[PDB]
Amino acid sequence: ESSPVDAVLFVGMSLVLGIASRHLLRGTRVPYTVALLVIGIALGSLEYGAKHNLGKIGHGIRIWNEIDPELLLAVFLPALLFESSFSMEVHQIKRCLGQMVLLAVPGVLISTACLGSLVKVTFPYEWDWKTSLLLGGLLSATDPVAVVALLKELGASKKLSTIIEGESLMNDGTAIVVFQLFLKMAMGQNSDWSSIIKFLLKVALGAVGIGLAFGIASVIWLKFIFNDTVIEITLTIAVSYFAYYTAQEWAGASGVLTVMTLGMFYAAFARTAFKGDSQKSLHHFWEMVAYIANTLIFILSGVVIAEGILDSDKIAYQGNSWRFLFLLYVYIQLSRVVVVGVLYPLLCRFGYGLDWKESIILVWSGLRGAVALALSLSVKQSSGNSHISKETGTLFLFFTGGIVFLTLIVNGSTTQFVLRLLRM
Amino acid sequence: ESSPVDAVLFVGMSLVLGIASRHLLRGTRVPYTVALLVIGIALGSLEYGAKHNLGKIGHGIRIWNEIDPELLLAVFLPALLFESSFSMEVHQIKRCLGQMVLLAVPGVLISTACLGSLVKVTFPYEWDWKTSLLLGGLLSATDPVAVVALLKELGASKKLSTIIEGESLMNDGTAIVVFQLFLKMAMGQNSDWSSIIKFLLKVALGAVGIGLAFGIASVIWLKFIFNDTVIEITLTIAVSYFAYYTAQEWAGASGVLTVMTLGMFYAAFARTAFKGDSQKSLHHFWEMVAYIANTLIFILSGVVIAEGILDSDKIAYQGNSWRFLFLLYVYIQLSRVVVVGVLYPLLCRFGYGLDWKESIILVWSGLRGAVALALSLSVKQSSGNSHISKETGTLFLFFTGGIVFLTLIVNGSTTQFVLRLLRM
Numbered sequence: 001e002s003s004p005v006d007a008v009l010f011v012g013m014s015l016v017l018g019i020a021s022r023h024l025l026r027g028t029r030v031p032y033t034v035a036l037l038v039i040g041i042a043l044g045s046l047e048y049g050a051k052h053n054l055g056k057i058g059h060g061i062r063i064w065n066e067i068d069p070e071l072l073l074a075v076f077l078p079a080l081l082f083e084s085s086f087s088m089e090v091h092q093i094k095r096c097l098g099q100m101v102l103l104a105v106p107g108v109l110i111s112t113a114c115l116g117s118l119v120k121v122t123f124p125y126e127w128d129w130k131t132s133l134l135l136g137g138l139l140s141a142t143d144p145v146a147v148v149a150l151l152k153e154l155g156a157s158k159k160l161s162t163i164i165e166g167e168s169l170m171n172d173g174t175a176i177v178v179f180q181l182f183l184k185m186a187m188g189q190n191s192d193w194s195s196i197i198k199f200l201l202k203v204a205l206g207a208v209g210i211g212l213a214f215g216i217a218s219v220i221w222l223k224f225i226f227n228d229t230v231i232e233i234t235l236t237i238a239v240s241y242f243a244y245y246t247a248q249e250w251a252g253a254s255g256v257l258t259v260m261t262l263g264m265f266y267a268a269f270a271r272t273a274f275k276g277d278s279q280k281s282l283h284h285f286w287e288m289v290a291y292i293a294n295t296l297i298f299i300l301s302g303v304v305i306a307e308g309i310l311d312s313d314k315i316a317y318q319g320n321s322w323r324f325l326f327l328l329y330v331y332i333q334l335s336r337v338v339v340v341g342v343l344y345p346l347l348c349r350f351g352y353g354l355d356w357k358e359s360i361i362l363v364w365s366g367l368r369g370a371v372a373l374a375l376s377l378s379v380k381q382s383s384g385n386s387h388i389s390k391e392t393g394t395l396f397l398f399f400t401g402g403i404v405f406l407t408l409i410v411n412g413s414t415t416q417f418v419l420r421l422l423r424m
Numbered sequence: 425e426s427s428p429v430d431a432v433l434f435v436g437m438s439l440v441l442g443i444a445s446r447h448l449l450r451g452t453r454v455p456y457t458v459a460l461l462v463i464g465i466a467l468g469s470l471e472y473g474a475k476h477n478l479g480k481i482g483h484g485i486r487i488w489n490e491i492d493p494e495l496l497l498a499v500f501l502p503a504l505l506f507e508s509s510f511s512m513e514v515h516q517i518k519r520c521l522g523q524m525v526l527l528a529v530p531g532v533l534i535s536t537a538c539l540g541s542l543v544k545v546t547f548p549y550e551w552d553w554k555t556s557l558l559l560g561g562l563l564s565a566t567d568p569v570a571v572v573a574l575l576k577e578l579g580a581s582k583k584l585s586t587i588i589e590g591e592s593l594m595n596d597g598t599a600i601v602v603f604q605l606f607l608k609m610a611m612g613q614n615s616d617w618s619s620i621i622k623f624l625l626k627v628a629l630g631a632v633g634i635g636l637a638f639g640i641a642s643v644i645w646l647k648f649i650f651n652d653t654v655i656e657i658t659l660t661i662a663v664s665y666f667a668y669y670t671a672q673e674w675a676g677a678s679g680v681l682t683v684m685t686l687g688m689f690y691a692a693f694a695r696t697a698f699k700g701d702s703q704k705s706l707h708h709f710w711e712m713v714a715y716i717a718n719t720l721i722f723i724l725s726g727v728v729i730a731e732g733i734l735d736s737d738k739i740a741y742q743g744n745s746w747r748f749l750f751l752l753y754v755y756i757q758l759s760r761v762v763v764v765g766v767l768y769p770l771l772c773r774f775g776y777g778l779d780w781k782e783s784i785i786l787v788w789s790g791l792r793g794a795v796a797l798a799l800s801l802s803v804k805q806s807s808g809n810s811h812i813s814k815e816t817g818t819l820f821l822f823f824t825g826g827i828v829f830l831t832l833i834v835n836g837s838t839t840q841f842v843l844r845l846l847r848m
Contacts, residue, residue: 003492003494003495003673004492004494004495005492005494005495005498005669005672005673006673007495008495008498008499008668008669009666009669009673011661011662011665011666012662012665012666012668012669013662013666015658015659015661015662016662016663016666018658019655019658019659019662022652022655023648023649023655026650056673056674068428068429070427070429071428071429071431071432074429074432075432224447225447226450228446229708229712230708230711230712230715231443231446231447233708233709233712234439234443234715234716235439235440235443237439238436238439238440238443239440241432241435241436241439242432242433242436242437242439242440244432245429245432245433245436248429249429249430249433249480250480280704280705281704281705281709284653284654284705284709285712288653288654288657288658288709291654291658292658292661
């Protein structure tokens, strides 16, 4: 009965369920992530919706369903984001840092504002300031994996595909702080406009610092460490997964920023300690780790959607949700528009500039992915409280697990089509 | 309080502590596993023996101390015994199949009896024959990793470094079946003489078959699968950890044999399906997964040894244990002698033969490692029953820990000395 070994079964099944998808969806427009999400939705519906006795597979599903709200993050978010923070070049980022900062930081502090105000004034589900701008902050998070999987699959400029790539790998570093502050306000405090500057001074501003400290320590150690690849590969794990803990748990910060700045430093200086025997292996190991984390997140996020919304069709049958996710879809398009527009003055005059075709390609390339789903899971799995309740934590996940599907399918197919029409 | 995320601390702690040892104990005779075991003993003594509140480290110790038996054996053993199975040279093995068989199968079916008889007739712990042959059949397991570390550390041969290498690689596949049958007999079965033949006909004999089936299916898929290194590595993980589950949990077999036969099949028939891009990545990834598993096992089996023997110094203060592990050591040495000698007639007449120097090096080199420690740890995590009490399982773990400590602190240094003394 729910034997712990059954959990390994999930690791043995989801992965292959991912692998087949990656085999069955290679040249097709639809990525494997949406296939994983729909498979997870169907499996969860068969497990909790119909309550069919499924077996040891069901035992594994029920084991990973009770994944702890922050253990989920500690296992998957560093895994999801160290590949992206690590597999980025520095030569093409020192030429566009100004254009990335003013596409990521004021690219999310306005993106959250717009599409959060719209849902605050439009959703009749009896929401608030904090619990609606929390959704605004979490869902304005673009996958740094799907964007690269489109900007390398589809031929594009080496500098445009640099903008679309360097945008996401700070969107998911400043959409997790415009997430955590509103989550903290919703859960255990109030709208304190005096301690926001304290929260943003501890988190981020010390997360990056502790990440840099761990990075310099690890690079010194690696320079001291002689020729042994398996020591270095496991030391990357022993520093990332440990600095994440020392940040979130021992400093109350956002350890995701710690694991991302570790990748920042490594990619900046992966030539003084790492040898040529390790570049070809570590960049293959961490992409596989991110692939595993992405598969598990996109399938367990379908399982949890089915657990929450398909208990007794409590939310699925309601018409206040199915016709309102498309409303947030047009809201996120409007948010992307009002993010590119209000920044274009300082965007085209900084870094590399932006042509009209380049601008219209940057829009419709904002692919939502595993980070928004992971944060929605981190809220739904931490629901049931007085303020954050079953009608809100589950609604975050219902909204995100449909919007990430829509952005990854329709917004990808139409982006490919408009790229084909708009010759470049 | 005992937050699950604290488990990552342990993953973040051991994985750096081992990296310390492997860095410091690089050119020293004693391996890093001894340092890991002594560190684990120290931490367990500090948290249980003295009940010192370490803090979140103590919570991590406690989250990785209720590890369930067949979750202990479903995460580490398939990982601890796939690096060696996969990294097997078959061209040098097809010339010694008979010599490997008549060092593994009758190499353990005799060495189990020789140890079990002496411990049964000498240990005053009121030990049944089944639970004494259990120790005799689980302690006759030599890890491939330590023996290959010694035989590649310094000057050796190609007809010796392969015989000891193919020795351990099946000693920890027939010290698993001579372990599980004794454990099953002690748990809830009798001494029926048809039960043993049924058990051997089903288990390891359907395990090899299912491992071959999974291997051929995976190789067909790889032949279908185009150039994707990360897909291939993920498929290797999702076939090893999933075939183990399908064997142990869906067929009652010993999946530890299934993962090993998958490794053998990959080493033999799967070197052209994998491209040259993958032969440098899988051999760098699995040598690190096994490194992680070996680092976790040698410290987990220090913490659990401490919690079993340092509760209230229930067993440590007893003089029936601290002077009886050396009796087990001399029994191990005698068993090694009487297993090389009895087989020497047909051993030197098949394969590469065996000179007197080669014979005296094959004996006296029976390095006990993490495979016996893991089995004793699984037994202790299954203790508390009427047939085997908590005292019996703790005694198993203590005896195996002492044997693996001794054979890795002394049997290696003395072998290094006697190879230069005996003009190798």
